[PDB]
């Protein structure tokens, strides 16, 4: 219920703390919300389910935000800019959810969790190639380079920004100087 | 030599299963290997652009040939005791980035025309490229080789440098 949400947010926070270089315990978490260790399981069968709900929140957020973009912008280049900004801003506002995107927070959790993350990225990348291909349908003159290279190139930029954000201890924010960086990234597109 | 790498890269994967000390000595080796290699590059190529190319190839190739050592550069391997170790790795990237910036700054004196953009931005752009590739190499379980299609990717990354 309402308590369910309040439990996930506490975890995302702990995931961004030193806990991530460690291991979140059902004990350390039930008190955060105040409820009993047992009452915690009334909303979550296990700690793994909590991660899933977090991963699921992540995919819903990204996927849904991307869909909106494609309806507010008809331009290919502008759509690409927004998708990257979207992934960088999301990370920045959710330092804990980023440690999952980067895998660091899944090291001592069900390796199956990394799988979901890996599938999510492929999903992102696939959406990115789909967008770039349409440039020929929208602008006639499309990209003279394979969309698979371009899309991966872009997602690598995003992942590299998130990775630098995590290791630096959230010091180097993903969006800092984004608009100054984007033109350099767009220069890679053809 | 390269043999002193396969052995240590093999050591890193083994310890993930004092340990802190070793990982520290390993972070030292990684630095010593990367720094030395970059210096040698600056002696075989005078061209700024080509120098930037070789330095990125170096980082990518090193990681690719040492999956266990990349796990350290990406921090994943330091996720069990962590803390200070990740900090030393951070200092490693700061050293690489700095080197990257110094190289970039020499374009004006060497070729005449420099960059219209701040070297701090460009350097962090190339290093972000490398960290993205490396990180995707780890989460893919070493399937996405960091250098795959490098020569096709490099002209694009170079397009960001004026």
Curated annotation (Swiss-Prot), chain A:
Compartments it resides in: Cytoplasm, Nucleoid
Keywords: Cell cycle, Cell division, Coiled coil, Cytoplasm, DNA-binding
Domain of life: Bacteria
Principal location class: cytoplasm
Listed GO biological process terms: cell division; negative regulation of division septum assembly
Coiled coil ranges: 111-136
GO CC entries: bacterial nucleoid; cytoplasm
Pfam families for this protein: SlmA-like_C, TetR_N
Database matches in PROSITE patterns: HTH_TETR_1, HTH_TETR_2
DNA-binding region: 25-44
All copies of domain HTH tetR-type, residue ranges: 2-62
GO molecular function: DNA-binding transcription factor activity; transcription cis-regulatory region binding
Stated family: Belongs to the nucleoid occlusion factor SlmA family.
Physiological role: Required for nucleoid occlusion (NO) phenomenon, which prevents Z-ring formation and cell division over the nucleoid. Acts as a DNA-associated cell division inhibitor that binds simultaneously chromosomal DNA and FtsZ, and disrupts the assembly of FtsZ polymers. SlmA-DNA-binding sequences (SBS) are dispersed on non-Ter regions of the chromosome, preventing FtsZ polymerization at these regions.
Record-linked PANTHER family: HTH-TYPE TRANSCRIPTIONAL REGULATOR RUTR, NUCLEOID OCCLUSION FACTOR SLMA
NCBIfam families associated with the record: PRK09480.1
Description of how the protein assembles with itself and partners: Homodimer. Interacts with FtsZ.
Record protein name field: Nucleoid occlusion factor SlmA
Source organism per UniProt: Klebsiella pneumoniae (strain 342)
């Amino acid at each position: 219920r309402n308590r369910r949400e309040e439990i996930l947010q506490s975890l995302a926070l702990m995931l961004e703390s030193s806990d991530g270089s460690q291991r979140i315990t059902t004990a350390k978490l039930a008190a955060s919300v105040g409820v009993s260790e047992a009452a915690l399981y009334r909303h979550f069968p296990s700690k793994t389910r909590m991660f899933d709900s977090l991963i699921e929140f992540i995919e819903d957020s990204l996927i849904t935000r991307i869909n909106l973009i494609l309806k507010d912008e008809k331009d290919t280049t502008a759509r690409l800019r927004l998708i990257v900004l979207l992934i960088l801003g999301f990370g920045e506002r959710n330092p804990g959810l980023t440690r999952i995107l980067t895998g660091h927070a899944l090291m001592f959790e069900q390796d199956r969790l990394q799988g979901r993350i890996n599938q999510l990225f492929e999903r992102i990348e696939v959406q990115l190639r789909q967008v770039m291909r349409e440039k020929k349908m929208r602008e006639g003159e499309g990209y003279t380079l394979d969309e698979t290279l371009l899309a991966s190139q872009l997602l690598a930029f995003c992942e590299g920004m998130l990775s630098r954000f995590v290791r630096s201890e959230f010091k180097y924010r993903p969006t800092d100087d984004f608009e100054a960086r984007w033109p350099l990234v767009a220069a890679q597109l053809q």
